[model samples]
Target: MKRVVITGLGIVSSIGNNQQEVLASLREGRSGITFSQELKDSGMRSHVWGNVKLDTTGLIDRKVVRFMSDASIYAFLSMEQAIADAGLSPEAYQNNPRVGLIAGSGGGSPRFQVFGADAMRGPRGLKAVGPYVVTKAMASGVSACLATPFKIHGVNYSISSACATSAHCIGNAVEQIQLGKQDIVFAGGGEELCWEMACEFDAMGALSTKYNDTPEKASRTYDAHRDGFVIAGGGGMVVVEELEHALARGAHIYAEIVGYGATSDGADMVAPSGEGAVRCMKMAMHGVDTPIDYLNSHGTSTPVGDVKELAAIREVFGDKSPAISATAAMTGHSLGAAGVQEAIYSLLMLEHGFIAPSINIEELDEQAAGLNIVTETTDRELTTVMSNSFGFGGTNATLVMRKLKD
Candidate 1:
């Protein structure tokens, strides 16, 4: 199999618009999570989240801008950066097969229903639904929106694995490269928060409401005071390449994609299993010959879910478990974008000589207290880092990244 490496990166999250700002927020342990009435409704008391500062009147054009909801905007914005970052000149390639686009957007535009409802209620013939309905509402919209801007004609598809959507997308792209189907692929995820989606998460009681006042400190993963996961919103982009192509191009390779392990809990759709998570971790470690130094776990701050996730980590690492860090507390969980943003954060941490601390993990959860949690920032040996993400329905995925080498 051909080696795969990340060559470009971009981000749109509560932390910041790009990599530097996101890393800054991490080092300072500043919580991007905050509370608001912007999208609150129903029985929600006060849910905290990571929201993007919307500039409706700035850089983005309003006509085409209005055509798509915020979800599409996030997807396209990340793609714009990924292509440019990979040094893909506008006319860089003649055959589109060499380039493919895979992206994920979990809760795309909760307003999609609003528009559809308006159209159905209107007297006109679905005019309010607009001609862009299919372009914005469908699951594939994210990748389609991205491909249009870049004139990409290659394989373009949107991947959905719930919170792990982007993680699977990245993994799929890596597999594509291994099969020699593409030279480069833009992979990552985008998720914009919506009232309906928030309520969906709230119904399951997965949202954090404890630190509503100090939103920045809300997503306390593994902390004793932690209540639940924070439902943050945002998006991100990444550039990945097949190894030989990167070497020939002398691209600025960030990390090597070693192994990816994805699985279903098989025991329960909502509740995760410790044994399942352990096997998944062991599966991901199949090809690695070196000791793993860091693991970016799927620590959503939930009592049950995170406990199982950490238990699995320790089981796989045995007595030599490496430093554990969960970046969600810093960026808030970005739903569909969660996996992708966290993946990007993990890779960036590997590149910049720092391992992002789990922002609010002061007192580890009793289930996870035995494992060492990396918090308040630290220098990283970072030869290998594993990015793990779990989502609704017990969908679990893990990605192992290592410093770029032959």
Candidate 2:
């Protein structure tokens, strides 16, 4: 099996735009949570969210913008950043059969509402939808759009596993490389859930509603006051390249993709399982020997999700508990994008050697007792880092990354 390395990372999130900005936000304990007036106006239970600010005037192709949806734009822009960071040129990827693209998301576009709204017009329903609706509505649209300009000539597809979408994308890319199917893969996840999107979670009672007035404190992972996840939208992209290929090009490597684990409980649709999470974490450490120094949790601030994850970690390593922090407290929960975003944060923490704070965790829940959870940002030298992502439908994924070695 070939070794896979992470050469580049790009993120478009509520907290920040790029790696540098995101790192600053993590260290400074910045909270991107905000009370959405739109949600309030709609009379939704959860009014708070991780609101991302974006501008694509000249940043994106204005001509194709008409055909692309907001989700595609987010993925495209983040893909551009990842490619640039990895020093990948159009010449290098054009007609390159060894390059692949794997993008993941929960829903394609929130604008798809227009399709349903128009469908009510009966005969004019078909005419009401534009030619791009097909591309805009499918979950694979992000990957298709990414493969077009990026020239991913190899396998190009999208995966949907609720919040585990992006982590699964990265894991699938690594497997392809290990199987000698590809040399490089643009793997990540993007999301554009907003407005109507929150309603789904609210309807399912999966969103935080207690701290609507205190938006910043709305997402409280591992806290006694925790309620539920705050729906968020954004994108996180990474360039995964085979070690030999990266070294041949003398590319600067950030970290090595040492292990990946995925599992399903076959239990409840939305409820998380501690046993399944424990098995998932254990599977991620299959080939890993280095003690985990840090853990970027799949802590969505949901009451059950946070506690079960901690219990799973405790069961995985009894004596050696790694310092854990859930970035979701700051980024809320970016659904499909959460995995890739948290993975980027893990990479950043590995390279920078610091554990980002799990903000708004002032009161630790009894279930989270006996865990070395990081509530305040602190410095720490780390070699191995684990990032966990669990989604709806009992799906779970975990990625183990280590500092690149000679």
Candidate 3:
């Protein structure tokens, strides 16, 4: 099997719009979550949200924008950044059979779907709905929008596994490169924040309602007083290519994709079993002897989820404890985009020789005791790191990355 490595990283998130901005936010332990009047007016129990503020006025063509959703727009923006960062010209991947694109979201265009239905129910009837509504509302729309503009031709598709969507995308992209099916692949996920989406989670009682006044403290992952996850939306993209391919093109390498593991709990739809997560982490580290220096956890701030994930980590590593931090406390939980966003955070931390803190933890849970939980920004040189993402329906994905070495 061929070796795979990351050539570029891009993110448009609540924390920041670009890598430099995000790095600053991570270092300062800034919280991107804020109170949302829209959510409150919509009668959701949770009023906090992590929303992105970006002006895409002239970045994309107006004609193409008409057919895209907010999630698609975010994905396009991140993909554009990743492509440019990788030093790839339009001619390089346009109609290139050796390149591919894979991206997705947990829920596709909920705002469009909700508004479109309301339009159809109005006096104007079906004529009120635009022609682009169906295309923009489809789950595969993000992938299509990302691939069409660049003309990616190989293995183009999307994967939807709730919060695990982008991690699975990265894992799949790594397999494609390792198998020689594609020399390079752009992989990531995007999500759009809407009251319609928030309403569903609210109905499920899966949103943090206790910290509505102090939105910044809404996501207290692994905290004793944790409530639930705060909904957020954004996009994250990465350029994955075979090591030899990246070297031949003289691309600047970020990190090596050493291992990827994915598994299902086969238990519950929402609650985690912990067994699958343990297995997934072990599988990712299989055959590797190096100790993990840091772990970016899928700490969604949900009361049960945070504790369960910690338990799983203890089961996998036994007596050894790696420095761990969950970035969702700062950026909120971006659902489908959470995995890729955290992966980008892990890469940045690995590259910059620092570990970002997991803020908002006034008191850590006793269950998380005896663990090297990073509560403050620390300067450390990391070689091997891991990122974990678990989703609804018991889906789990774990990725292990290493600093570039000869």
Candidate 4:
């Protein structure tokens, strides 16, 4: 298989716009959690999510924005950053129709609820609905738009795997590159705030209560007071290029895509399983041919599901478990966007040679199984890093990253 490397990456998130800002916030162990009236208005029990202040002007045409939703705009904006960062010119794009885009987002827009509700009730209903409702709301729209901007004629699409969507996209992009089908692919996930998803979780009782006024304090992953995940929404775009193509262009190589693994837990849909999580990580390690060097976990800070993940890590990494961190506290959970955004954070941490500790992790819950979560900041040498995203419906994905030496 041909090696895959990350040529460029860009992100607009609650923490910061790009790697530098993100790294700084990570180093400081700051949490970007906010008590969002938006979430409350949407009927969510918790009013916290990672929010990104992004400007979408350059990414999409003025005509396009009128009909588009916030979710689609996020995907377009981030992908544009990735393309520009890679220095992709019209010549470079024209030379390779093999370029592909794999964007992911489980939910399209919060505004969908507004449209759907009215249509369900009365004549006030379907009359205002646009003809492009389904087209605008479908999962594939983001990638479809991306393919247009880059004029990529081959291997262009999107994926929906709950929170694991972007990881699946990353894995798929790596596979295509290894198979010599595409030289470069823009892959990531985006999830905009919507009352629908948030209310479902709230109804299911998966939320933290400690941080209503103190949003940052609520996402304490390993804390004794840990309750549940804050529904975070944001996305990022990354340029994944074939190793040889990147080297040939003299492009700046960030990291190599050494491994990817995905699996399912049929036992339960909402509850996460330790066995399944371990299998995915182990498979990814086997693919990379390396011991797990670093990891960004799906630490959503829930009472049962979140702690189960750390337990699984203990079974795998044992003594090293105490040294890893979860960006979820700071960024909440970006859902589809979680995969690429956290992957980007892991890459940034690896490149800088520091491992940020899990924020809000005060004491481990004794009932929780295992894993030595990196509770405090530390400096470490990293040859590889892994990011995990496990979404609802038992979809789990893991991506392994290796520092590029040349």
TM-score, structure 4 vs. true: 0.93
Q: RMSD for each model, in Å, please?
A: 2.0, 1.5, 0.9, 2.2
- What value does the lDDT take at residue 183 in candidate 2? 92
User: Pairing residues by index, what is the TM-score of model 3?
Assistant: 0.98
Tens digit of lDDT per residue, candidate 4, span 15-83? 876677888888888777777887777666688777776666655786565555666677777777787
For model 4, state the Cα shift of residue 262 in Å.
0.8
Relative to the true structure, candidate 4 has a C-alpha RMSD (angstroms) of 2.2
Per-residue lDDT tens digits for candidate 1, residues 1-406, read: 7889998888878887777788787677667776777645456854578887656355555555555656667766766666667676767642476888888687666667667877879898587677777667777767777776666666688889788899988988898888889888888878867776687777777788777788877788888887788887777878878888887887888888887888888787777887767776777789799778888888887778777888788778877888888888777788888877888888888887787888766676777756778876898667888888787777878889889764
Per-residue lDDT of candidate 3, residues 197-234 (tens digit): 98999899999999999999999998999889999999
77, model 1: CA deviation in Å? 1.4
Off by over 4 Å in 3: none
What does candidate 2's lDDT look like per residue over 1-406, in tens digits?
8999999888888788888888999999899888899988888989999877767677877656665666677778888889899998988866799999998787777667555566647677667665667777777878887787666799899988989999999999999899999999999988885676778889989899999989999998988999899888889899999999999999989999988999998898888877888899999999798999999999999888888888889999998999999999998999988889999999999999899999897888998878888988899888999999998899999999998875
- lDDT winner: 3
Better of 2 and 4 by TM-score: 2
Task: Please name the candidate that would achieve the greatest TM-score relative to the true structure.
Answer: 3
Two-way TM-score contest, 1 vs 3, winner: 3
Candidate 2 local distance difference test against the native: 0.87
- Candidate 2 is scored at a TM of 0.97
